[PDB]
Each structure stands twice: as C-alpha cells, then as structure tokens.
Amino acid sequence: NGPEIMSKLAGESESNLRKAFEEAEKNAPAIIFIDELDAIAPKREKTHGEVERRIVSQLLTLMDGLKQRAHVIVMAATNRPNSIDPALRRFGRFDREVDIGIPDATGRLEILQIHTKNMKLADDVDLEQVANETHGHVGADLAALCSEAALQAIRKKMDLIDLEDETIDAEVMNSLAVTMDDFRWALSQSNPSALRETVVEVPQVTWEDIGGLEDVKRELQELVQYPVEHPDKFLKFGMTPSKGVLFYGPPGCGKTLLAKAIANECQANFISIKGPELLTMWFGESEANVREIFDKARQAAPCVLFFDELDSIAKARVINQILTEMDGMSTKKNVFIIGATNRPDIIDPAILRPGRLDQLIYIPLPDEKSRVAILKANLRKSPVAKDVDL
Amino acid sequence: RPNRLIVDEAINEDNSVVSLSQPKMDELQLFRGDTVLLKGKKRREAVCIVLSDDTCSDEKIRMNRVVRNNLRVRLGDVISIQPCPDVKYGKRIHVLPIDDTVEGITGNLFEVYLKPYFLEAYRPIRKGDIFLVRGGMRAVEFKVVETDPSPYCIVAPDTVIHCEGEPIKREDEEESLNEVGYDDIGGCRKQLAQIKEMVELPLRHPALFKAIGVKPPRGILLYGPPGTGKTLIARAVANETGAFFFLINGPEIMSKLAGESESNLRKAFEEAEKNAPAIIFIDELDAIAPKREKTHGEVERRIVSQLLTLMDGLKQRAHVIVMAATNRPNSIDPALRRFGRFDREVDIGIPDATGRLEILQIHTKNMKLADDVDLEQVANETHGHVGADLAALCSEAALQAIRKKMDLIDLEDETIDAEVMNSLAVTMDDFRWALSQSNPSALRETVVEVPQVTWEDIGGLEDVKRELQELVQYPVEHPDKFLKFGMTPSKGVLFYGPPGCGKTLLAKAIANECQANFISIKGPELLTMWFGESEANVREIFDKARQAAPCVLFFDELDSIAKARVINQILTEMDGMSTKKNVFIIGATNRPDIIDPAILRPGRLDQLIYIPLPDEKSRVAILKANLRKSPVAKDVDLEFLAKMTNGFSGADLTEICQRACKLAIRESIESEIRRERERQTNPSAMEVEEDDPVPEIRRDHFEEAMRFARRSVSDNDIRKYEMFAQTLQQSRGFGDFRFPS
Amino acid sequence: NGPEIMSKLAGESESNLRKAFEEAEKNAPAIIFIDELDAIAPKREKTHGEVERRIVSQLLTLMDGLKQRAHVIVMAATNRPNSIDPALRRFGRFDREVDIGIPDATGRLEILQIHTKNMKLADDVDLEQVANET
C-alpha cells in the first residue's frame, strides 16, 4: 500500500520495504504491486524534507537490485506520468507504461453488466440506453449508480417497509425489481461525473452523414488511408507521407463532422482540443503544457489529433510550442494533425512551410445533395410525418 | 398494528404502572403480574408492571408523572408498549439522591425510603428511572446509574447495600438532557431529511442492504460555514437511532507529543470497531489535514497518511461511518476525496428567512416573552446571521431587558430578591436594540433560496412570459415529451435592454414560479476575479450550482470586463457542463454589441430576448407594487399617474414613490416641532389624543414630487437597442412559402 | 505572559498552560489574562515550524474545554484583529472584541492628571493647554 509504508515511524518503513522485496525474492514467480506511487515518490518540488528522499532512494536501490532469474515484476499505479519523480523513469526500473484510460460508450455496458448480476431487473430496463448516456463516468461511479437506483427502488416501497414491522418480512427481500425510471432518477438527480480531460475513441459518424464533396473525400482518402492501408507501395518509390492538412471555410459547414468521418472510416482514434482549451494555456502562461497532449497522441498510434480554431490566439507563444513539437515528431508513427480555421489570412505563415502543414483544403458552403443529406440526418430521432417533403 | 397509544393523565399514586384496556385482553394475553417496556422519546425507555382497569380510554393510557418524564413524553405524544420476558432478580442497583430536598441527611436513610416501598409488587426498575419516594416531607428520587442485571432489575430486600458515595447535584441531569432529538435542530430541514435518508436505513436495517448487495456509505462531508451546529446534527442523527457516538476533536489530536497522536487515532478507530453500529465524528478537519501548500513539516503528513490508512482499513460488515466537518471542499487535502474514503458531500448552508424562525423559536423556549414581540418580523430581517449569532441576539436582548431594570436591581440589595427573577418579559424594542446596536453578520458569500417575487409584480410582457415558460418550465415539468421527439433543451438565454427596466425582478420570477433555487453574482464580484488575477475561481460557483440541481444562476452585467480572461473561464466550463442537470444560465447586459461574439455560438447562449421599456399596464403594476408598505390615501389615483409618465424607465418611477415618501416625512417631522413648541404649553385644552396630521401620503405630495421627475434613458440610445434588434435579421428575406399539393 | 510561555524548553510550555488553566478552574470566579497574543499565535503565514502549531492547538483545546459553571473568562490583548490566527475567532472562543483606541483631546487631560499627582506644580501651568496639543 501507498501510505501504509508512510505511516510508520522513522527508520522503520524501509524495513517494511526490504521485508516485502525479500518475501517476493524468496517465493515463486510472483508479482508485487505498489498502489498510490505519487504519495511515496512525488515530483522533486513536493519534497521539503529528507526522509521522503530516503524512502525514494531505498525504492530505487531495491528496484535496481533484482535479477532477471528471480522472476519478480513490479507494477505501480499513478494517475499521470508527469506526477512521478523522474529519476525512476530511466532504463531498468520503469519503462513500459500502459494506459487504462476512461471506458467508452460500449465499454461501459459490460462494466454495469457485471454489477447488475445479483440484482433482479425487470423487462422494461434497457442497459444499452443508459450506456448511451453517462459520459464521464468511471467504474466506481457506475457502481454508485447501481446502488443508488436500487436504494431508490427500495425507498419507493416504504408503504410495505413500515415502522410497525421493524423486522422486515421475506416478501420485499426477493420480490422487488428495479425499473427504468429509477435508473433515470439516479442518473439525473445525482452522480456528478468525475471526468474533464480528453477521451480517445473511434467516432461513429459515417461518410453518408454529409454527402457530396467527392473531391474532398478522394483527397482525404489519399492523405490518410493510403499511408496506413498500403504502407509498402509508399516505400516502393519513396514518396514520404504528409503530416497534416489545414481546413478553412465559412463558420459552421460541418468541419468537425467531416474530420471525424475519416477517423471512423480508417478505424482510427480521435482526440480533439478546442479553442478555449487552447488559449487558456497562454492566458495563464502555461505554455509548456502541450507535450502531454502530443505524447498522449503518441501512445495511441493511429490517431488524428484535431485542433479547432487555432487562430483564436490571433486576437492579440503556443503556436511556437506546437511548432517546435511538430518537427520533432517522427513519420513512422501515423498520427496526423488536421487544423481548422475561419480567418485563414490572419494565421501565422510559419505554419504553412513545407514539412509542417502543407495542404490547404477549402470547404465550401453545402450544395443541394449535401443539404438533403444533412436535413435527413438531423431527423433520425424525431418521428416525422410521411408526407413531409424534404 | 395495535402497539402505540397516546398517554393521558392518571389518578392513582402507584409507581411503575401502565394502564391497559379491558376490551383488549386477548391479543397480548399477558396477565397482571407481567412486566413490559415502554418506548419513549430521544431513545430513553422505562419498564413497568401492568394494571387492567376501566378508567382508561380505548387508545389512551393513564400513567403517573415520573414515568411520563422518564419517557420524556407529554400530553398528545404517542408511546409504544411491548412485552419483555427477561425479568430476573438483581444485586445492588445504585440508588443516589439527585435532589436538593435531602435537608442534609446522610448515612443510612434506605431503611424507610427503599425497603418498605418496593415489596409485594415485584417492582421493575430500569437504569436511569427517576421514581421518587416521599417520607418525612422529603420527596427523594433515586435515579439509578448502575444496574448489575440487564436491562432492568427487581429489587429484593435481601440485597446488600453499597452507598458510600456522596449525593450530587443537577449536573448529571445536564449530561443527560444533551441526548437531543430531531426537533432540537432547525434551519436545515431539507439537509436533515437527506442525511437521514443516507444514514438511517443502513443503521436500522443492516441486513437488507447486504441482502440486495448495495454499498452503505463510508464517509460523508458535512461542509458549511462555521457555527451552524455541525456537531449537534451528528449527535441528533446518532441518538435518534441506536448508534454510538465518538467525537474526535481536531486540535486535541494535534496537541499531543510526537508519536502519540497516532496512538489516539488508532485507539479511537479500535473502539469504534469493537462497539455497536456506531458513528465517529471528526471536527475541524482542515486543521489536521489542510491543503498540500500548508504543510511545511512532515509529522502532519504522517498524521494525514495515518488517517488515510485507517480510513481505508474499514470493512463493510463493521458498520462504522465517518463524518467530517470542513467549511469549503477546496480546503482539504485532495488525496482523501477519492473513491472509498470521502465521496458523498452534503451542504448545510446558511439558513434562509423562514428557516430562521425555528432556530430562534428553539432558543426563546425558556425565556418569557410578552405579547408585543413578533418573531416573524425579526426573522424578516437579520440577513446573514447564523445559529450562534441568533443565540447571541437572544442573550443580548435578555441582557438589555435586565439592564433597563436596574431601578430594582440595586446596589443596596446585593442578594437579588425573587421578584425580577421570574417577572421580567422581553419586549420588541429590546430585540430591535440588540439587533441594531450590535451583532455584525458573519456572512458575505452567496445564498441559495427560492425567491418570493410573483408574476404579477411586473405585468405585461406576455410574449416574454410565454418564451421563458417554454425555456424553463417545460424541460423540467414534462421531461418525457422532450424525449419523445428528441429535441434537446437549451441552456440559457441572454437578456438585453435599457438600464433598469426590471431585469432581475423578471429573472427571479421564473425561479419563483418553477420553485427553483436562484444564486446571483454581480458585476463587481465578477471583475474582481481578473483584476487580481484569480481567474480559476469560477469552478466553485459552478459546482455549487451543480449541487443544488434545479437552479438558475444569473450573471449580471457580464460586459463589465469589456471596458479594457474570465469570459473564457466560463466558456470552457459551460461546454463541460452536462444537460441532464437542469441548471440554466441567464445573463444580462446593457451594451449588447460590445459583448464577445463567442458567447453567441449555438450551444452556449443562443436566445436573445429583448426587454423593452415598460408599457402602461406594467407601469401601473410596478407603481402599485412599490406602495405595498406605505399607507396611501384612497383618493390618490394611479391610472392617471400611469398614462402621464410615458417614456419613463422602470427605475425612474420607482424614485418618485420615494421622493413623495420623503416629502411627507419632512412634513410629519416638522408638524411635531410646533406641537411640542407651543407657547404657554398649559394643561388646559390639551390634546390627549394624537392629532396625526399626516397619517398617510396625501395627494399634493405626489403633485409636488412629480415636479422633479426626469427620464433617464433618452431617445438616441433606445434606437441603439432597436438597431441591434435589426442586426438580428428578424425573420426577413423570402417570407411565406407553401409546400406543393 | 506572552513570551514567558515561549521561552521554555520544548514539551514544557504546554505544561505551564495546563497548570495555569487548572489553577483558574480550581479557584474562585476568576479572570486570566494573556498578554501579547500575537507572539504565541500569529497568522498562519508566520508559522514555519510546528511546535508553535502545537502551542496554538493546545490553547484552542484548553479554551474550548471550559464550562459555563466554572466562571472563568479569558481576556487577550493584540494590536489589530487581523494579526491573530483566524481559527480562534470562531464562536465559542473569542467573539466579543472591544477597542480601547487612542485617547482624544479631553481624554488626555485625566491621563496626565493621574500622573501629575505626586509632582508639585506651580500656578502658571495649564494642563488644558498642553492637553490641547500632543
């Protein structure tokens, strides 16, 4: 445990660490686990004493003191890789780093399928529908949602669970099933989501969601699909792939709904940062805080990170912070940078140098077939009368 | 279920006796010589033998005074009766004279007060029973505290005696009356109901929660401003059930030596684990676990980590819950707000106006009030007071009523006679003095409440009323029809108009109509964030709105920072706010062109309702509305004053109904000068009646106050808002077309 | 005194505070007095160690540990109410705050009338005139 080897006296916690690693060495092919690593080894700025430095160095020495024949591996658990003392991210101690991030929409159905096992549900509930909502929930929040819905279904049955019957009879103990509006109450009335950061997923918009623009479809296919679906033919005659286009057009003509379409078609992940999330970096002088949103894109290899209104800081830097990062990013990874704008003349011309952001695709106003496509697309949910022409 | 019955008066003198009805004998089937337990208030009980008589009613029990007081029940209250087959003989119940009517007798009195009184009855005596014995003009009540059998005892005469201790005074009663009830706490009735919902059903039913498989809570945060009795509420919750309290103080486990405070924490959690379904309480959490910035040493980090380890080390079968108490949730070490330690967080905030009446109703209990006082009136004022401040107000008013009676409370009578001790009642101007002369309010932050303005307070604007009804009421009163054909609700409108035409008095009206809470931040509270670079300080004013679910947070003059950021800080927060919560953001402005256009993107703030100048019916409505308090003469016309003031804004004609009041108060002050300055003021032909020259506002006060009227808004600036209304394209273009047939 | 319960060894000043409050509890209706409160309980910014936090918390616990039947009241003495640790201005410890400010012109005549008692003055002096200045 994390703070259990912190709540000892001085000079005794290291005895516990040595005893734990000795018990790991003596036993079978085994695995130790360190929970809450950032409470025993924070960043160097959060170390005002010295006994914590003794614990950290003891951890480093005992970590490097293992043998490859001993067959013991160490798993730690933090929340963000910049919240660790960087003296233990060197080679030999902690290198491979996996990311069990936020579960997505269809990744949320099984996590409450496993919690609704011992609870009798009725036939009106629809786990797919509640899974469709609850953006931002984590597994513990969904356990709390299930418990709150069961408690609301108990609390509506106070007409039988009375004060006159203190000992509760065996009637309601096995004859109460939760219904759908209990879930909607427990979702609506309570449960604030504990999520504000980015989310990686494949989008579900389709190509016919915005019809037309066949030249743009052919161009985006030539710039995204072909360097990843056929990577050998790009090596036959040596053409290097491009690393990003720049859309520009009138405001609100389906730019994001077009940028997500190629991500869905390629089965590629899609992160998205926006305007107000961007310029709040340099309004509060946190300029060196785009490295994390780029190496997060490095971890998910086939992604397409999408800026949005990157001219928002051109009302009066961070363009240079992306600019020093885009050239340092290699090309064997297939991450692409599509940026959107509405005032294309006010942009910095250094972003248009060949190598950084070369293509300039112009998105026009919607034509007729695209208009009937988007008009039918917005009326999926609403039942419309059959004689309503479109 | 025929168990609970009301209690009424009795005639008989026998003790530990409960009255049953002779038509109902065969359901309980217990005879005369059987012992029963009676459930009473505040979790204290007593035991009795039964009597079967006809003088009792069908649902009413006739019982004597001391067991009515041991159950703490009075006339009207309903008690329960149940059989208890665990009757047995015992050894040395510990009797003790708890009164000052002993008359100095000491030694062995128990041969005439105990041994002849108990026999030929099988007298059942529970621990804490307050039965009296009268002998020789000495009515001594023996409240036992140590009973070797459990829970009650039958006293035998062969029981050996143990009475070496000293009789004590009323202090042991003073440590039993603070086993308080639900009625002893007011001002937070909603939060009391919510925390009772959270706590009480696991505690009284430990088996059903394990039976379904739900998780009982492990830590509740009782955050709120200090002094509102956040420790009395936990005592009430624990004592209204069969719990066991344990008060861990804040700096008491900080004032020990090094290496010894953690021993106290381990001993406290071990005592909680060993005992019953219990509740510990940690007062002043932010003194033992502050934010990380306020930790320069390391021993405090050892205490914090010890708290974290012992918090996570509990089991769901142990049935112990932890309540802490801070003042603001950003004032805690955020390593203990994770899942499993402290998640559910209730908010016993500032009591409101009608929430303040019961909190001094409970303090004015033992003080004799007169008939002129009006607790509703003092409750109407005192904005900002908390419960301790109202206790101080009551004490200061009683002290001022004492201090005015120094003519009898003299220096010649050092020992004060029993006259003024029970014949002094507080009157209303004492309360007004103690409110005015003293008691600064300890409140500056926001307040959540439902407003009390009504729709007819500003008449007219029926299109705006229909629009606000369509944008606020229908997504919450009928949430299923918005799901039938999938229209998502909007999340806020933006008013704009001339300055002072009743914007806030219109925005509060829909909050009152929807029975919705209403917070309000203003201009100078807004831009003082970015003038002192506290830009990341709107997250708290948004999640405070998240906690109260049906609220309508109202900005005011949000263009105040457009004289030379925080618009971006609201802008990154509004998109992150979900839509299943029904919080709405109505913002007001006066210069609608200077606003940031990024606030007008669809999704953030879409609707643009234009509030015009007040028309005629709205003018007569607001003019009658401002004259509720002032008595006005019945011949003072108002429809003629309505259609005469034509271009006047709503904030200008609210001024002339204060100028007329000032012009009448001048004449009513001046008329009293000559009446006391009568030359040769003789008792002959004296006006014993009050003449009352100005009893109400007459006609010529308005006829003279109208002469100083001035329209504030010109014509050149109302054309600016009309031009901005034309900048919205305003349904212009093609116009009508028809579908083909 | 203020720094007298600061000039002890570590772990011994709290013994002095407990002995003082015990002597107040045992005796008559009494009054204790704490001079120079801002040297044993300053603002939180002026606390770099932790033993001063132990003294402050000991003062808080012993302050709240009194009973209304004990008849002991506590008077402190600072120079400005923003120069105290604000954890002891809550309800139950230190609420009522009087202000013996600067004496005024005619409030200055009696304060030197009481000092010129044992000094023989002549007839030409005028205490009202010197009171008018200063």
mmCIF file of C-alpha atoms in Angstrom, chain A residues 319-329:
data_model
loop_
_atom_site.group_PDB
_atom_site.id
_atom_site.type_symbol
_atom_site.label_atom_id
_atom_site.label_comp_id
_atom_site.label_asym_id
_atom_site.label_seq_id
_atom_site.Cartn_x
_atom_site.Cartn_y
_atom_site.Cartn_z
ATOM 1 C CA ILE A 319 1.842 28.318 -31.858
ATOM 2 C CA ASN A 320 5.594 28.169 -31.388
ATOM 3 C CA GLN A 321 5.191 25.397 -28.832
ATOM 4 C CA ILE A 322 3.343 23.254 -31.359
ATOM 5 C CA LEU A 323 5.851 24.408 -33.955
ATOM 6 C CA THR A 324 8.871 23.064 -32.106
ATOM 7 C CA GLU A 325 7.000 19.834 -31.447
ATOM 8 C CA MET A 326 5.722 19.013 -34.930
ATOM 9 C CA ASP A 327 9.204 18.863 -36.421
ATOM 10 C CA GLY A 328 10.454 16.661 -33.596
ATOM 11 C CA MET A 329 7.671 14.159 -34.219
#
